[PDB]
């Protein structure tokens, strides 16, 4: 009877996992409708099997896991408070309902009863979707999520899901703790460890989506587009990986067109902007008193854009004119094209910006210490080939001979939501 309830709930979870196999996008418009009809049929025959064995909270946590409702399993786990997997399913029920605080309450209760992998993973989730009022509270919740995911790994080093919550957690540390590239390296390492140890981690569309979003932020566009394409193949009905893929593709199309065409600027205006370029637009990079990231006073040489090497050109400073600017919907990287002579145009990616910050066409822009990157992107018959100079913050920009204040810089924030 209880084994019949076990079979009924694993058949219902098999239906919820196999909906996109059996029905797919032709019938996944009726996703919630057909799933709630299946759960009502399972609830009915569930109830007739419960009716013999109503007393058992194992019977009622199986009923609540099938409903994974709130009042049913709340009475169940009031009857048996020790029941950790029922707490996990109940926190997942309020997570689906949107009650993040009550989900955190149930998972914290589950870890106070008995430490286990599911409660560690789910608390490490829900502490990131908890609404915060202050930044130190947000950072404390992120670091606590990293701790719960680490203990989840220490309970199961074979759990690709647990490595996925680690990848999310180190991504949140990267976007909350000053953007150390070691943390993003560890996040992508956790994603690679998940894909190495677990075959069902390959079938999760969320791991590819999050890893591809991190690759998009670190400008690995080809592996990013592979990630959104694989997530769109895994869940075609959920159109947000498709939306992210198409907006990144249209960004690459518009960007490569603007680098090739130099932003539709007529050549007389282009020569006028090149002839208006003066050494006074270097600002504080022209007197030899520039202080680098290591704190040394390094005399900079003005190097042309065409002769630069990939990586950080040490001691070099570049000076150009904006011919086009571009931003996305998501508007973390501000892109603009610079030319210094009649040669090729170079894209500049500016991160950690305020929403109102930008440069105008014709502005003299001087960048000390340029960090080159050669972009070679192939995805679904579309090819892209350009060079982008990545700068991390607008404080390293010299625009019209004037540095910016601290009001132009704001660190890009991470959002985790149901």
């Amino acid at each position: 009877i209880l084994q019949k309830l076990q079979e009924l709930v694993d058949q219902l979870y098999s239906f919820r996992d196999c909906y996109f196999e059996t029905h797919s996008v032709e019938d996944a418009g009726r996703k919630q409708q057909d799933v709630q009809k299946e759960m009502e049929k399972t609830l009915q025959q569930m109830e007739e099997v419960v009716g013999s064995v109503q007393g058992k909270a194992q019977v009622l946590m199986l009923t609540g896991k099938a409903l994974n409702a709130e009042e049913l399993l709340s009475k169940a786990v009031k009857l048996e408070p020790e029941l950790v997997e029922a707490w996990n399913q109940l926190g997942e029920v309020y997570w689906k309902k949107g009650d993040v605080a009550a989900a955190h309450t149930c998972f914290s209760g589950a870890l106070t009863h008995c430490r286990n992998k599911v409660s560690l993973q789910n608390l490490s989730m829900v502490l990131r979707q908890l609404r915060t009022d202050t930044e130190d509270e947000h950072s404390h919740h992120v670091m606590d999520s990293v701790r719960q995911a680490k203990l989840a790994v220490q309970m199961d080093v074979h759990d690709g899901r647990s490595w996925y919550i680690l990848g999310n957690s180190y991504l949140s540390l990267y976007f909350s703790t000053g953007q150390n590239p070691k943390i993003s390296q560890q996040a992508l390492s956790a994603y690679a460890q998940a894909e190495k140890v677990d075959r069902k981690a390959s079938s999760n569309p969320d791991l590819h989506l999050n890893r591809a979003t991190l690759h998009k932020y670190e400008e690995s566009y080809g592996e990013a587009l592979e990630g959104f394409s694989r997530a769109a193949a895994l869940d075609p009905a959920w159109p947000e990986p498709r939306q992210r893929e198409q907006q990144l593709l249209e960004f690459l199309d518009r960007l490569t067109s603007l680098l090739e065409s130099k932003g539709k600027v007529k050549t007389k205006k282009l020569q006028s902007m090149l002839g208006s370029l003066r050494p006074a637009h270097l600002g504080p990079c022209s007197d030899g008193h520039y202080q680098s990231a290591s704190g040394q006073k390094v005399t900079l040489e003005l190097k042309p854009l065409s002769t630069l090497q990939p990586g950080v050109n040490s001691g070099a400073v570049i000076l150009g004119k904006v011919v086009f600017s571009l931003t996305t919907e998501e508007k973390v990287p501000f892109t603009f094209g610079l030319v210094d002579s009649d040669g090729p145009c170079y894209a500049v990616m500016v991160y950690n910006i305020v929403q109102s910050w930008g440069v105008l066409i014709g502005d003299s822009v001087a960048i000390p210490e340029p960090n080159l990157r050669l972009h070679r992107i192939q995805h679904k018959g579309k090819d892209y080939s350009f060079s982008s100079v990545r700068v991390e913050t607008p404080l390293l920009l010299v625009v019209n001979g004037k540095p910016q204040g601290s009001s132009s810089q704001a660190v890009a924030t991470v959002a985790s939501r149901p």
């Binding site: 999310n168 969320d206 989506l209 979003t213 998501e330 950690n352 305020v354 929403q355 704001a410 939501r417």
Partner: peptide, 11 residues
């Protein structure tokens, strides 16, 4: 299942 977005800062 959870989704992650990364937006630019406001202040």
């Amino acid at each position: 299942r959870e989704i992650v977005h990364i937006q630019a800062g406001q202040c």
